[PDB]
Amino acid sequence: NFLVHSSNNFGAILSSTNVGSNT
Amino acid sequence: NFLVHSSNNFGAILSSTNVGSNT
């Protein structure tokens, strides 16, 4: 399909539900 | 399908539900 590669960065995620791609 | 490789980084995740891809 669309062949993703994030190569992202973060931090101090809190009380969320989803952090990242989905299919 | 879409063949992902994150290569991400984070820290100080707390009280979340999901951190990463999903299918």
Next chain:
Amino acid sequence: NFLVHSSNNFGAILSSTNVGSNT
């Protein structure tokens, strides 16, 4: 399907439910 390899990093995860991919 979509053949993931994370290669991620983190730390100081606390009181969460899920940290990583899911199928």
Next chain:
Amino acid sequence: NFLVHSSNNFGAILSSTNVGSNT
């Protein structure tokens, strides 16, 4: 299916439920 290999790292996980992939 989607053939994952994490190669991740962390530490100071505490009072969570799940840390890793799931099927």
Next chain:
Amino acid sequence: NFLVHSSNNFGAILSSTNVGSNT
């Protein structure tokens, strides 16, 4: 199915329930 090999690392896990994959 999806043939995982973690190769992860951590430490100072405390009072959690699950640390690792599940099926």
Next chain:
Amino acid sequence: TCATQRLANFLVHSSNNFGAILSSTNVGSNTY
């Protein structure tokens, strides 16, 4: 890269949070 702490105090209070509350105080320590 010059960095140093010499601080006296700090207080925190919260009755019953539903969410979370951080308190970070570090020096020079890069965090991934």
Next chain:
Amino acid sequence: TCATQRLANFLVHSSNNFGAILSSTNVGSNTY
């Protein structure tokens, strides 16, 4: 990379959190 702590005190209080509360105070120690 110059970094050092010389600090006197700090206090924390919370009745009953539902969530979490960090308190980080480190020097030069890169954290993954």
Next chain:
Amino acid sequence: TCATQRLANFLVHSSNNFGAILSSTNVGSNTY
């Protein structure tokens, strides 16, 4: 990589947390 602690005190209090509370104070010790 210059890093060192010379600190006097610090206090923590919490009645009954539901969650967690860290307290990190380390020097130069990279943590994975």
Next chain:
Amino acid sequence: TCATQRLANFLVHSSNNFGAILSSTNVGSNTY
């Protein structure tokens, strides 16, 4: 890699936590 501790004191208190509380103070000791 320069790192060393010369510190006097530190205190901790908590009535009845439901969760956990760390207290890390190490030097140069990489932790996996």
Next chain:
Amino acid sequence: TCATQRLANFLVHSSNNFGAILSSTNVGSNTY
């Protein structure tokens, strides 16, 4: 890799934790 401790004291108190409380103080000793 320069690392050494020369520290005087430190205290800990907690009434009845439900969870856990670490206290790490080591030098140069990599921990897996």
